[PDB]
A paper describes a structure:
To this end, the P3 cocrystallization method (incubation of protein-sclx8 mixtures at pH 4.0 and 4 °C) was applied to several chemically modified or mutated RSL variants. The introduction of an additional Lys residue into RSL was in some cases compatible with the P3 assembly. Previously, we generated the double mutant N79K/T82Y named RSLex.43 These mutations introduce a C-terminal feature homologous to the macrocycle binding site at Lys34 in the N-terminal blade. Interestingly, up to 10 equiv sclx8 caused precipitation of RSLex, indicating that this protein was more prone to macrocycle-mediated assembly than RSL. At 15 equiv or higher, the mixture was soluble suggesting that the protein is encapsulated by the calixarene. Crystals grew within hours, and the structure was identical to the original P3 assembly. The new potential binding site at Lys79 did not interact with the calixarene in the crystal, suggesting that additional features are required to switch on complexation.
The 6-bladed β-propeller Ralstonia solanacearum lectin (RSL, pI ∼ 6.5) was selected as the model protein. RSL is a rigid, C3-symmetric spheroid with high thermal stability making it an interesting candidate for protein-based frameworks. Trimeric RSL possesses pseudo C6-symmetry due to the ∼40% sequence identity between its N- and C-terminal halves. Here, we describe protein-calixarene composites obtained via cocrystallization of commercially available sulfonato-calixarene (sclx8) with the symmetric and “neutral” protein RSL. Cocrystallization occurred across a wide range of conditions and protein charge states, from pH 2.2–9.5, resulting in three crystal forms.
Author numbering:
A (entry chain A), B (entry chain A), C (entry chain A): 1 to 90
The structure:
Amino acid sequence: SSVQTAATSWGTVPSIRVYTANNGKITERCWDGKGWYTGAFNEPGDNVSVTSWLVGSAIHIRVYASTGTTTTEWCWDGKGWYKGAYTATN
Amino acid sequence: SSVQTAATSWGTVPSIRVYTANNGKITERCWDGKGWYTGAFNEPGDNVSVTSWLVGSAIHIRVYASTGTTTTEWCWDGKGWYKGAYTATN
Amino acid sequence: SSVQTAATSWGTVPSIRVYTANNGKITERCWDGKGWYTGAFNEPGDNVSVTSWLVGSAIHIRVYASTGTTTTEWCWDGKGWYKGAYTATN
Ligand SMILES: OC[C@@]1(O)OC[C@@H](O)[C@@H](O)[C@@H]1O
Ligand SMILES: OC[C@@]1(O)OC[C@@H](O)[C@@H](O)[C@@H]1O
Ligand SMILES: OC[C@@]1(O)OC[C@@H](O)[C@@H](O)[C@@H]1O
Ligand SMILES: OC[C@@]1(O)OC[C@@H](O)[C@@H](O)[C@@H]1O
Ligand SMILES: OC[C@@]1(O)OC[C@@H](O)[C@@H](O)[C@@H]1O
Ligand SMILES: OC[C@@]1(O)OC[C@@H](O)[C@@H](O)[C@@H]1O
């Protein structure tokens, strides 16, 4: 019933994203240098991990959301979240 | 009752920090290239995530410690741990 | 009984590694730019975290696998997984 978080950051400002899995829902809080605000990420799951990388100045984020034994990858390449190709056989 | 960890690293040596949430307490183990040792971070919580970034050679660490549904951000900018501005409405 | 994951990435392609702790076993799924595939990492544990760093083009990965209150570090320096020096007194 307690929340679980994952965090990533990029740059030097920096940008920070914190993902919280809470009661089956994963949401996102954002820092771009001046105030926390709610991000666009909203996906179901009880467990979350995240990684991100820059290509030049363009950020790419991958969030691994799991429900039960099933993990779904969600992708941000600057133009909205979409489901990635990740599969596992858990 | 089992522990949960989070890890971050920086540089090429590298520096590694491993945070362990255990029985409501989060502690920190450190590697700077030659031996593990206990770090200054000590904060309550049952769940931990971490991210870090360099500005030049200066490391900045953010630890997200959660108890129940409440997440507190702890900040290291080289001069002691202090509570950050992070809020969420879980 | 639900899975828990950790993720790391490097480069710009990028390379991604996703670790899944499931029913006491931690396994690894890999992306090197074109298709997910199963990695060599197989170690016991109920909880996983990971960090990685590059030295030039050489990747180094550290996986922190925990069972109960005992955390074991596993190391990849490009030539097979081996147990690291990490200790904690949980
Ligand atoms: O500026 C906020 C935002 O656009 O940053 C990139 C991603 O984290 C998005 O989910 C998020 O809404
Ligand atoms: O462009 C999306 C994608 O190819 O990005 C890299 C990996 O995250 C893949 O699983 C994912 O489908
Ligand atoms: O050298 C150890 C240390 O100073 O490194 C930076 C932070 O991880 C601190 O909590 C820690 O005590
Ligand atoms: O200087 C501290 C601070 O501004 O650093 C960036 C973010 O971690 C903020 O939540 C935090 O208050
Ligand atoms: O190319 C896959 C692989 O060699 O990548 C480096 C490590 O993640 C290994 O466990 C893994 O088998
Ligand atoms: O070469 C292996 C090693 O020295 O790498 C750095 C740290 O991960 C240590 O715990 C580990 O034993």
